Enzyme design. Structure first.
Site, PDB file in Angstrom:
ATOM      1  N   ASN A   8       1.151 -11.461   7.501  1.00 58.81           N
ATOM      2  CA  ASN A   8       0.231 -12.183   8.382  1.00 58.81           C
ATOM      3  C   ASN A   8       0.946 -12.668   9.628  1.00 58.81           C
ATOM      4  O   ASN A   8       0.742 -13.788  10.084  1.00 58.81           O
ATOM      5  CB  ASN A   8      -0.516 -13.321   7.681  1.00 58.81           C
ATOM      6  CG  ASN A   8      -1.694 -13.838   8.465  1.00 58.81           C
ATOM      7  OD1 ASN A   8      -2.474 -13.058   8.980  1.00 58.81           O
ATOM      8  ND2 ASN A   8      -1.839 -15.147   8.492  1.00 58.81           N
ATOM      9  N   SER A  38       0.798  -1.207   0.000  1.00 58.73           N
ATOM     10  CA  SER A  38       0.000   0.000   0.000  1.00 58.73           C
ATOM     11  C   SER A  38       0.844   1.277   0.000  1.00 58.73           C
ATOM     12  O   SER A  38       0.275   2.351  -0.173  1.00 58.73           O
ATOM     13  CB  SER A  38      -0.887   0.109   1.253  1.00 58.73           C
ATOM     14  OG  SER A  38      -1.998  -0.845   1.115  1.00 58.73           O
ATOM     15  N   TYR A  60     -10.113   3.105   6.307  1.00 57.99           N
ATOM     16  CA  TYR A  60      -9.169   2.782   5.247  1.00 57.99           C
ATOM     17  C   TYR A  60      -9.830   1.796   4.287  1.00 57.99           C
ATOM     18  O   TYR A  60     -10.367   0.779   4.716  1.00 57.99           O
ATOM     19  CB  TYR A  60      -7.915   2.234   5.859  1.00 57.99           C
ATOM     20  CG  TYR A  60      -6.767   2.018   4.901  1.00 57.99           C
ATOM     21  CD1 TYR A  60      -5.662   2.910   4.965  1.00 57.99           C
ATOM     22  CD2 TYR A  60      -6.724   0.993   3.962  1.00 57.99           C
ATOM     23  CE1 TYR A  60      -4.591   2.745   4.099  1.00 57.99           C
ATOM     24  CE2 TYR A  60      -5.639   0.852   3.112  1.00 57.99           C
ATOM     25  CZ  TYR A  60      -4.601   1.719   3.178  1.00 57.99           C
ATOM     26  OH  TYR A  60      -3.473   1.546   2.381  1.00 57.99           O
ATOM     27  N   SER A  61      -9.687   2.038   3.004  1.00 59.57           N
ATOM     28  CA  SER A  61     -10.254   1.130   2.025  1.00 59.57           C
ATOM     29  C   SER A  61      -9.443   1.140   0.748  1.00 59.57           C
ATOM     30  O   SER A  61      -9.201   2.178   0.118  1.00 59.57           O
ATOM     31  CB  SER A  61     -11.698   1.570   1.755  1.00 59.57           C
ATOM     32  OG  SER A  61     -12.245   0.669   0.783  1.00 59.57           O
ATOM     33  N   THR A  84       1.420  -3.798   3.376  1.00 64.93           N
ATOM     34  CA  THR A  84       1.271  -5.215   3.596  1.00 64.93           C
ATOM     35  C   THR A  84       0.769  -5.788   2.280  1.00 64.93           C
ATOM     36  O   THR A  84      -0.330  -5.453   1.789  1.00 64.93           O
ATOM     37  CB  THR A  84       0.235  -5.573   4.674  1.00 64.93           C
ATOM     38  OG1 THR A  84       0.631  -5.110   5.926  1.00 64.93           O
ATOM     39  CG2 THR A  84       0.138  -7.110   4.721  1.00 64.93           C
ATOM     40  N   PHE A  96      -9.873 -12.030   1.651  1.00 65.43           N
ATOM     41  CA  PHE A  96      -8.829 -12.611   2.509  1.00 65.43           C
ATOM     42  C   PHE A  96      -9.356 -13.018   3.886  1.00 65.43           C
ATOM     43  O   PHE A  96      -8.628 -13.019   4.881  1.00 65.43           O
ATOM     44  CB  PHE A  96      -7.606 -11.654   2.622  1.00 65.43           C
ATOM     45  CG  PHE A  96      -7.080 -11.230   1.257  1.00 65.43           C
ATOM     46  CD1 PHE A  96      -6.632 -12.188   0.340  1.00 65.43           C
ATOM     47  CD2 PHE A  96      -7.035  -9.921   0.856  1.00 65.43           C
ATOM     48  CE1 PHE A  96      -6.167 -11.815  -0.907  1.00 65.43           C
ATOM     49  CE2 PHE A  96      -6.548  -9.543  -0.361  1.00 65.43           C
ATOM     50  CZ  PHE A  96      -6.129 -10.476  -1.292  1.00 65.43           C
ATOM     51  N   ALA A  97     -10.627 -13.390   3.923  1.00 65.37           N
ATOM     52  CA  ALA A  97     -11.155 -13.933   5.158  1.00 65.37           C
ATOM     53  C   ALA A  97     -10.363 -15.148   5.648  1.00 65.37           C
ATOM     54  O   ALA A  97     -10.221 -15.280   6.868  1.00 65.37           O
ATOM     55  CB  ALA A  97     -12.619 -14.294   5.014  1.00 65.37           C
TER      56      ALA A  97
END
Ligand code: PNM
Length: 345
Positions: free
Chosen positions: A325, A60, A157-158, A299, A118-119
């Site tokens: 992660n 990002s 944030y999006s 990330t 990304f669940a």
């Protein structure tokens, strides 16, 4: 500023390895004196050591590159920050009152589609890594959800906001984001390690591999190096190096990349938390010794990046750990900012 603390930097990297980063590194440009440290491996299977010249995925941090392009378009009179996004991309968003400034500062309410993707960390990576999305595909995925708040009303944030950013760049310029990044940023700053190759999965030249930590504690790491990053594009797909991100954020903060007026707009801070703000594609972090620094985090699967500079751009720091992660590693790597800007305690 205080002297950067290399012993402290060394401890940060060693702690990050102890917590599961295969490799971790940091470069400080301290007003023309370099500090560079690395520990561990770029490729855990071959054992090749990580080094501060290894290229990597900045995640990002890409938003800052997108924001610079958009703010140059504002300088050129092609974009008004307070116009509606739908002025430029008709029919895109369900609310005509959502503005470009709201998108760039994460105050638009647009739902982040990546919360769908990304669940589960590794299954989600396996689902997107070899997919190619259009910008519109990602917007449509977001819009399946209602907005989360009124336009302009709340910081949330999006990634969707910087998918809109990419769409705006390409519509207003008639060119690809790669072309705009190259002509407006990479070439003028001579960023020879910096690329936007979407949807290619190869990282050009010598690079750190990325290692995605699975959700199951203790599980085997997944090599996540080669992926399209098409799920992020202008929100996340730049490749760079510690030296080039240092050069970029020093150039930004020292006023080389846009008018003074637009840099001031970029630095109008929306509160994130009690020690952080968000401008237009730009983060502010407030350090323990009362210094604030400016830049962005990233990330992307297998890579955690911090890239921040002082207010006048004279000191810049970029740190990379080639896992993701792994919140212990993420938290540890933030300490490079303390050691590099605040120095020995
Ligand atoms: C940029 O790096 C973004 N990364 C993601 O969308 C990938 C992701 C991360 C965690 C879980 C699921 C998907 C966003 N930017 C960073 C940053 O600004 O530091 C966030 C951690 C906010 S996600």
């Amino acid at each position: 500023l205080p002297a950067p603390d290399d012993t402290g930097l060394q401890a940060v990297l060693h702690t990050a390895l102890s917590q599961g980063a295969p490799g971790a590194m940091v470069r400080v440009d301290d007003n023309g004196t370099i500090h560079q440290l690395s520990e561990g491996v770029a490729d855990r299977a071959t054992g090749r050591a990580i080094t501060t010249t290894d290229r990597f995925r900045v995640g990002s941090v890409t938003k800052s590159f997108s924001a610079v392009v958009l703010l140059q378009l504002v300088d050129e009179g092609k974009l008004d920050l307070d116009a509606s996004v739908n002025t430029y991309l008709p029919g895109l968003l369900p609310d005509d009152r959502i503005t470009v400034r709201q998108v760039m500062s994460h105050r638009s309410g647009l739902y982040d589609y990546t919360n769908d993707m990304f669940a589960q960390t590794v299954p989600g990576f396996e689902s997107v890594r070899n997919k190619v999305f259009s910008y519109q595909d990602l917007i449509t995925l977001s819009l399946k959800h209602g907005v989360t708040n009124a336009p302009g009303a709340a910081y949330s944030y999006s990634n969707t906001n910087f998918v809109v950013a990419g769409m705006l760049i390409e519509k207003l310029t008639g060119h690809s984001v790669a072309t705009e990044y190259q002509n407006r940023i990479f070439t003028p700053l001579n960023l020879t390690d910096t690329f936007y190759v979407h949807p290619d999965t190869v990282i050009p030249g010598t690079h750190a591999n990325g290692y995605l930590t699975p959700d199951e504690a203790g599980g085997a790491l997944v090599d996540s190096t080669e992926q399209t990053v098409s799920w992020a594009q202008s929100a996340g797909a730049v490749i760079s190096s510690t030296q080039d991100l240092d050069t970029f954020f020093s150039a930004l903060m020292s006023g080389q990349l846009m008018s003074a007026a637009q840099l001031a707009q970029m630095q109008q801070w929306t509160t994130v938390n009690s020690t952080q703000g968000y401008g237009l594609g730009l983060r502010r972090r407030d350090l323990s010794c009362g210094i604030s620094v400016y830049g962005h985090t990233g990330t992307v699967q297998g890579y955690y990046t911090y890239a921040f500079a002082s207010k006048d751009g004279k000191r810049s720091v970029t740190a990379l750990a080639n896992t993701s992660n792994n919140v212990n590693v993420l938290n540890t790597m933030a300490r490079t900012l303390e050691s590099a800007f605040c120095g020995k305690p």
